[PDB]
Design an enzyme around this catalytic site. Structure first.
Site, PDB file in Angstrom:
ATOM      1  N   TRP A   1       0.880  -1.156   0.000  1.00 52.77           N
ATOM      2  CA  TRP A   1       0.000   0.000   0.000  1.00 52.77           C
ATOM      3  C   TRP A   1       0.915   1.203   0.000  1.00 52.77           C
ATOM      4  O   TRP A   1       2.087   1.072   0.370  1.00 52.77           O
ATOM      5  CB  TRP A   1      -0.835   0.018   1.282  1.00 52.77           C
ATOM      6  CG  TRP A   1      -2.081   0.811   1.153  1.00 52.77           C
ATOM      7  CD1 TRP A   1      -2.332   2.050   1.686  1.00 52.77           C
ATOM      8  CD2 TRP A   1      -3.239   0.454   0.397  1.00 52.77           C
ATOM      9  NE1 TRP A   1      -3.578   2.482   1.296  1.00 52.77           N
ATOM     10  CE2 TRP A   1      -4.157   1.528   0.503  1.00 52.77           C
ATOM     11  CE3 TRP A   1      -3.595  -0.668  -0.366  1.00 52.77           C
ATOM     12  CZ2 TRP A   1      -5.406   1.514  -0.132  1.00 52.77           C
ATOM     13  CZ3 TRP A   1      -4.841  -0.681  -0.996  1.00 52.77           C
ATOM     14  CH2 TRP A   1      -5.730   0.409  -0.873  1.00 52.77           C
TER      15      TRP A   1
ATOM     16  N   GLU B   1      -3.258   8.754  -1.763  1.00 49.58           N
ATOM     17  CA  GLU B   1      -2.485   7.506  -1.671  1.00 49.58           C
ATOM     18  C   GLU B   1      -1.747   7.108  -2.953  1.00 49.58           C
ATOM     19  O   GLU B   1      -1.496   5.921  -3.183  1.00 49.58           O
ATOM     20  CB  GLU B   1      -3.435   6.362  -1.283  1.00 49.58           C
ATOM     21  CG  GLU B   1      -4.534   6.761  -0.287  1.00 49.58           C
ATOM     22  CD  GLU B   1      -5.243   5.559   0.310  1.00 49.58           C
ATOM     23  OE1 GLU B   1      -4.739   5.028   1.311  1.00 49.58           O
ATOM     24  OE2 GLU B   1      -6.305   5.152  -0.207  1.00 49.58           O
ATOM     25  N   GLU B   2      -1.311   8.093  -3.728  1.00 51.23           N
ATOM     26  CA  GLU B   2      -0.686   7.802  -5.021  1.00 51.23           C
ATOM     27  C   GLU B   2       0.676   8.428  -5.273  1.00 51.23           C
ATOM     28  O   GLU B   2       1.500   7.854  -5.989  1.00 51.23           O
ATOM     29  CB  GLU B   2      -1.640   8.245  -6.148  1.00 51.23           C
ATOM     30  CG  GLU B   2      -3.004   7.555  -6.135  1.00 51.23           C
ATOM     31  CD  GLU B   2      -4.085   8.319  -6.874  1.00 51.23           C
ATOM     32  OE1 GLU B   2      -3.951   9.547  -7.050  1.00 51.23           O
ATOM     33  OE2 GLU B   2      -5.094   7.700  -7.266  1.00 51.23           O
TER      34      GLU B   2
HETATM   35  C1  LIG Z   1      -8.378   3.052  -2.079  1.00 56.93           C
HETATM   36  C2  LIG Z   1      -7.345   3.708  -2.975  1.00 56.93           C
HETATM   37  O1  LIG Z   1      -7.250   2.876  -4.156  1.00 56.93           O
HETATM   38  C3  LIG Z   1      -6.266   3.270  -5.112  1.00 56.93           C
HETATM   39  O2  LIG Z   1      -4.989   3.250  -4.534  1.00 56.93           O
HETATM   40  C4  LIG Z   1      -4.076   2.138  -4.664  1.00 56.93           C
HETATM   41  C5  LIG Z   1      -3.870   1.769  -6.147  1.00 56.93           C
HETATM   42  O3  LIG Z   1      -5.019   1.105  -6.648  1.00 56.93           O
HETATM   43  C6  LIG Z   1      -2.674   0.833  -6.324  1.00 56.93           C
HETATM   44  O4  LIG Z   1      -2.414   0.670  -7.711  1.00 56.93           O
HETATM   45  C7  LIG Z   1      -1.446   1.413  -5.648  1.00 56.93           C
HETATM   46  O5  LIG Z   1      -1.123   2.610  -6.299  1.00 56.93           O
HETATM   47  C8  LIG Z   1       0.255   2.828  -6.645  1.00 56.93           C
HETATM   48  C9  LIG Z   1       0.345   3.169  -8.134  1.00 56.93           C
HETATM   49  O6  LIG Z   1      -0.051   2.048  -8.915  1.00 56.93           O
HETATM   50  C10 LIG Z   1       1.772   3.569  -8.491  1.00 56.93           C
HETATM   51  O7  LIG Z   1       1.829   3.985  -9.852  1.00 56.93           O
HETATM   52  C11 LIG Z   1       2.212   4.711  -7.573  1.00 56.93           C
HETATM   53  O8  LIG Z   1       1.352   5.784  -7.735  1.00 56.93           O
HETATM   54  O9  LIG Z   1       2.145   4.296  -6.202  1.00 56.93           O
HETATM   55  C12 LIG Z   1       0.801   3.973  -5.795  1.00 56.93           C
HETATM   56  C13 LIG Z   1       0.855   3.612  -4.324  1.00 56.93           C
HETATM   57  O10 LIG Z   1       1.671   2.469  -4.105  1.00 56.93           O
HETATM   58  O11 LIG Z   1      -1.717   1.617  -4.269  1.00 56.93           O
HETATM   59  C14 LIG Z   1      -2.762   2.577  -4.021  1.00 56.93           C
HETATM   60  C15 LIG Z   1      -2.873   2.763  -2.517  1.00 56.93           C
HETATM   61  O12 LIG Z   1      -1.709   3.375  -1.989  1.00 56.93           O
HETATM   62  C16 LIG Z   1      -6.506   4.724  -5.543  1.00 56.93           C
HETATM   63  O13 LIG Z   1      -5.441   5.135  -6.394  1.00 56.93           O
HETATM   64  C17 LIG Z   1      -6.551   5.635  -4.299  1.00 56.93           C
HETATM   65  O14 LIG Z   1      -6.751   6.992  -4.685  1.00 56.93           O
HETATM   66  C18 LIG Z   1      -7.689   5.154  -3.383  1.00 56.93           C
HETATM   67  N1  LIG Z   1      -7.832   6.035  -2.200  1.00 56.93           N
HETATM   68  C19 LIG Z   1      -9.189   6.598  -1.988  1.00 56.93           C
HETATM   69  C20 LIG Z   1      -9.980   5.815  -0.922  1.00 56.93           C
HETATM   70  C21 LIG Z   1      -9.574   6.086   0.554  1.00 56.93           C
HETATM   71  C22 LIG Z   1     -10.619   5.506   1.512  1.00 56.93           C
HETATM   72  O15 LIG Z   1     -11.891   6.133   1.345  1.00 56.93           O
HETATM   73  C23 LIG Z   1      -9.367   7.588   0.830  1.00 56.93           C
HETATM   74  O16 LIG Z   1      -8.779   7.767   2.118  1.00 56.93           O
HETATM   75  C24 LIG Z   1      -8.468   8.227  -0.224  1.00 56.93           C
HETATM   76  O17 LIG Z   1      -8.305   9.607   0.075  1.00 56.93           O
HETATM   77  C25 LIG Z   1      -9.088   8.078  -1.612  1.00 56.93           C
HETATM   78  O18 LIG Z   1      -8.280   8.760  -2.558  1.00 56.93           O
END
Ligand SMILES: C[C@H]1O[C@H](O[C@H]2[C@H](O)[C@@H](O)[C@@H](O[C@H]3[C@H](O)[C@@H](O)[C@@H](O)O[C@@H]3CO)O[C@@H]2CO)[C@H](O)[C@@H](O)[C@@H]1N[C@H]1C[C@H](CO)[C@@H](O)[C@H](O)[C@H]1O
Ligand SMILES: *[C@@H]1O[C@H](CO)[C@@H](O[C@@H]2O[C@H](CO)[C@@H](O[C@@H]3O[C@H](CO[C@H]4O[C@H](CO[C@H]5O[C@H](CO)[C@@H](O)[C@H](O)[C@@H]5O)[C@@H](O)[C@H](O[C@H]5O[C@H](CO)[C@@H](O)[C@H](O)[C@@H]5O)[C@@H]4O)[C@@H](O)[C@H](O[C@H]4O[C@H](CO)[C@@H](O)[C@H](O)[C@@H]4O[C@H]4O[C@H](CO)[C@@H](O)[C@H](O)[C@@H]4O[C@H]4O[C@H](CO)[C@@H](O)[C@H](O)[C@@H]4O)[C@@H]3O)[C@H](O)[C@H]2NC(C)=O)[C@H](O)[C@H]1NC(C)=O
Ligand SMILES: *[C@@H]1O[C@H](CO)[C@@H](O[C@@H]2O[C@H](CO)[C@@H](O[C@@H]3O[C@H](CO)[C@@H](O)[C@H](O[C@H]4O[C@H](CO)[C@@H](O)[C@H](O)[C@@H]4O[C@H]4O[C@H](CO)[C@@H](O)[C@H](O)[C@@H]4O)[C@@H]3O)[C@H](O)[C@H]2NC(C)=O)[C@H](O)[C@H]1NC(C)=O
Ligand SMILES: *[C@H]1O[C@H](CO)[C@@H](O)[C@H](O)[C@@H]1O
Ligand SMILES: *[C@H]1O[C@H](CO)[C@@H](O)[C@H](O)[C@@H]1O
Ligand SMILES: *[C@H]1O[C@H](CO)[C@@H](O)[C@H](O)[C@@H]1O
Ligand SMILES: *[C@H]1O[C@H](CO)[C@@H](O)[C@H](O)[C@@H]1O
Ligand SMILES: *[C@H]1O[C@H](CO)[C@@H](O)[C@H](O)[C@@H]1O
Ligand SMILES: *[C@H]1O[C@H](CO)[C@@H](O)[C@H](O)[C@@H]1O
Ligand SMILES: *[C@H]1O[C@H](CO)[C@@H](O)[C@H](O)[C@@H]1O
Ligand SMILES: *[C@H]1O[C@H](CO)[C@@H](O)[C@H](O)[C@@H]1O
Ligand SMILES: *[C@H]1O[C@H](CO)[C@@H](O)[C@H](O)[C@@H]1O
Ligand SMILES: *[C@H]1O[C@H](CO)[C@@H](O)[C@H](O)[C@@H]1O
Length: 472
Positions: free
Chosen positions: A119, A178-179
């Site tokens: 994560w 989280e990106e």
């Molecule tokens: C729940 C979150 O889901 C997604 O985050 C994941 C993502 O699917 C994974 O692929 C990975 O992302 C990596 C990228 O692939 C990589 O290119 C580089 O950017 O690093 C990142 C991180 O390792 O992991 C992430 C999780 O870290 C989606 O993109 C997020 O935006 C989602 N978050 C949302 C839900 C959450 C709960 O309600 C909220 O707190 C948050 O603010 C939302 O944005």
């Protein structure tokens, strides 16, 4: 109008839905432990059946404010949350243990066990948000004669989170979305706020927070680097434009009703925050078919950042609501000050809404003031109407709504969406949160230093809660 009636009913739906998503009696989240705020009851595609430190802290701060305003029935929910966090803080996880970085862990399983998969960690905004949520309740406890609960339960929990913030603020980590692994505006902004109100709370309980004191001005010094001259850069170490609702959220979540339009702290009515508002909102005007045909003086559906591809990149209910909330906050500040100023920096924001706008100071009795506030209020309400238009018939709010047809998508019944509706509605009604002390924490040091201060860590055990009786 219908917006007013819709909002009144929706505020009731929102309160109910939030409670349904909190364990261990929440109707939609059987399996969640006591006081655990679940992000969404969706267990698959997407699986949001976890508890995030950020979502929980934001939702609980909202409930604490409603509670302090008379919603006394929320008392047990708040107590359960605090008790659950005493346990969560000590849970060994991929970010570390209590004293070795564990507090920065983004999410946990609903049964309070660590989430061990990959994560984007750590996310350093979490401890700051949790501290802010608890401090508000701690203030109420102090004010209402429950000193022991504030000093023995709340303060020690807050002390742990404040120590984490002072020790690691100057290190990279992931943003609120989280990106992006870098340094983020929202995060730095909420961390500065947490240290400031943390120091005040420490003094109030007869203790101290030297690390809050030494680090707060340095975090503020660094926060100034995010201003590009035209908008607020969302993240350093990113290849994107930097226009991101992350910055609107940073402003509304650090809004202090006693503050003026301060640029140094990016208050809602500050010229920097107003210029940023237009830059960010405008970035979504041509990328969503849903926004076709709308003029620059009309509200539009707002997403996270223009480069977003999550579920193909769509507007978000909480992002559209944040666009409205910043304006409701600004209206409140102008009204309280008795004037509004237009500068070269914020001119474009005003001109788009009132073509006769010109730099100068406008008193609240002037014709220009009246014209501008009317236009701003209509614009703000416009964002809320878009939310009303795409909410489910029974009031359900998902994470996103389709960029083309407006259908709800991604996680259903997102707890944060409901909290964002509640805060936007409150601000619209001039119901503001308690001050955090911005008026004595907006002075920027002459020279910024890359530094930190180590505080102290100690595990808290919540033996029991005194029989607190809340009435009012
Ligand atoms: C729940 C979150 O889901 C997604 O985050 C994941 C993502 O699917 C994974 O692929 C990975 O992302 C990596 C990228 O692939 C990589 O290119 C580089 O950017 O690093 C990142 C991180 O390792 O992991 C992430 C999780 O870290 C989606 O993109 C997020 O935006 C989602 N978050 C949302 C839900 C959450 C709960 O309600 C909220 O707190 C948050 O603010 C939302 O944005
Ligand atoms: C406003 O009205 C709406 C409409 O009623 C309300 O929303 C509904 O609320 C109910 C709950 O009351 C939800 O029920 C759950 O459904 C999921 C399955 O959801 C998926 O499938 C649905 C049905 O799909 C089929 O029919 C539709 C329609 O005909 C059709 O379009 C589709 O093609 C297919 O044919 C979809 O509707 C649903 O879509 C929604 O969600 C998407 C994802 O979030 C979203 O993108 C969509 O836009 C849409 O919003 C989705 O695809 C069931 O899995 C779930 O079952 C669990 O919960 C019940 C109790 O609620 C329990 O009896 C079950 O045993 C099961 O329990 C597990 O999960 C619980 C948490 O959810 C947990 O507490 C339990 O302990 C247990 O967990 C354990 O097992 C899981 C296994 O995966 C594991 O992961 C855990 O870790 C743990 O071990 C419910 O039945 C409806 O989905 C929802 N409908 C809609 C359209 O949203 C809304 O609440 C109302 N609002 C207000 C304010 O009143
Ligand atoms: C720890 O604390 C220290 C002390 O506060 C931090 O050090 C400061 O860091 C900032 C940010 O790097 C730095 O500001 C840069 O100054 C340069 C000139 O001296 C500028 O060229 C640079 O420009 C970027 O930011 C502008 C806005 O200020 C943008 O308009 C411009 O487009 C630049 O942004 C692009 O390029 C950057 C590359 O840096 C990229 O990351 C962005 O995504 C974007 O593409 C900055 O203004 C200060 O000079 C530093 N101060 C001191 C005293 O050294 C340090 O960053 C902190 N570290 C962490 C991890 O928190
Ligand atoms: C923010 O706080 C500073 C003091 O730190 C003031 O000088 C400023 O006017 C604003 O109130
Ligand atoms: C305003 O106050 C800050 C500390 O809060 C100082 O660093 C600054 O130099 C000014 O005196
Ligand atoms: C970071 O740097 C400051 C001075 O710039 C120190 O006071 C602190 O102890 C840490 O080393
Ligand atoms: C925070 O980090 C600084 C280095 O910038 C240390 O000097 C300090 O002890 C704390 O670990
Ligand atoms: C930072 O450093 C202090 C001592 O300088 C510790 O007590 C704290 O746990 C953290 O490691
Ligand atoms: C940091 O300081 C706290 C409070 O004094 C101690 O309890 C802890 O053990 C550490 O030394
Ligand atoms: C550190 O502080 C906590 C909170 O007071 C105690 O529970 C622990 O035993 C240690 O003294
Ligand atoms: C503080 O941390 C300890 C572990 O170090 C836990 O046992 C306790 O429950 C609390 O979380
Ligand atoms: C709270 O206190 C208990 C003992 O009463 C510890 O075991 C726990 O780690 C925390 O300090
Ligand atoms: C609640 O009270 C008990 C009393 O024995 C402590 O041991 C525990 O740490 C908590 O403070």
């Amino acid at each position: 109008a219908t917006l007013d009636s819709w909002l009144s009913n929706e505020a009731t739906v929102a309160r109910t839905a939030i409670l349904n998503n909190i364990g261990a009696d929440g109707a939609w989240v059987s399996g969640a432990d006591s006081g655990i705020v679940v992000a969404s009851p969706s267990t698959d595609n997407p699986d949001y059946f976890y508890t995030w430190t950020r979502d929980s802290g934001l939702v609980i701060k909202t409930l604490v404010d409603l509670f302090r305003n008379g919603d006394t029935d929320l008392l047990s929910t708040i107590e359960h949350y605090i008790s659950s966090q005493a346990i969560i803080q000590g849970v060994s996880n991929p970010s570390g243990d209590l004293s070795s970085g564990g507090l920065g862990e983004p999410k946990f399983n609903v049964d309070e066990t660590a989430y061990t998969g990959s994560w984007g960690r750590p996310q350093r905004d979490g401890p700051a948000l949790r501290a802010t949520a608890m401090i508000g309740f701690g203030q109420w406890l102090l004010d209402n004669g429950y000193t022991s609960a504030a000093t023995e339960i709340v303060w020690p929990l807050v002390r742990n989170d404040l120590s984490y913030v002072a020790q690691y603020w100057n290190q990279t980590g992931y943003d609120l979305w989280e990106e992006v692994n870098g340094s983020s505006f929202f995060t730095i902004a909420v961390q500065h706020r947490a240290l400031v109100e943390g120091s005040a709370f420490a003094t109030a309980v007869g203790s101290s927070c030297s690390w809050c004191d030494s680090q707060a001005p340095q975090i503020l010094c660094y926060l100034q680097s995010f201003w590009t001259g035209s908008y607020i850069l969302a993240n350093f170490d990113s290849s994107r434009s930097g226009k991101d609702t992350n910055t609107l959220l940073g402003s509304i979540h650090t809004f202090d009703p006693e503050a003026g339009c301060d640029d140094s702290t990016f208050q809602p009515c500050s010229p920097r925050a107003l210029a940023n508002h237009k830059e960010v909102v405008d970035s979504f005007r041509s990328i969503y078919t849903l926004n076709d045909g709308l003029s620059d003086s009309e509200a539009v559906a707002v997403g996270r950042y223009p480069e977003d591809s999550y579920y193909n990149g769509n507007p978000w209910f909480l992002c559209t609501l944040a666009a409205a909330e910043q304006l409701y906050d600004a209206l409140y500040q102008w009204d309280k000050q008795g004037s509004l100023e237009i500068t070269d920096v914020s001119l474009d924001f005003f001109k788009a809404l009132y073509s006769g706008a010109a730099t100068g100071t406008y008193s609240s009795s002037s014709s220009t003031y009246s014209s501008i506030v009317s236009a701003v209020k209509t614009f703000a309400d416009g964002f809320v109407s878009i939310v009303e238009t795409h909410a489910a018939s029974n009031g359900s709010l998902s994470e996103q709504f389709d960029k083309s047809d407006g259908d709800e998508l991604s996680a259903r019944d997102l707890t944060w969406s409901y909290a964002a509706l509640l805060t936007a509605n409150n601000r619209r009604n001039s119901v503001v949160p308690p001050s955090w002390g911005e008026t004595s924490a907006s002075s920027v040091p002459g020279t910024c230093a890359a530094t930190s201060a180590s505080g102290t860590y100690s595990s808290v055990t919540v033996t029991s809660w005194p029989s607190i009786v809340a009435t009012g």
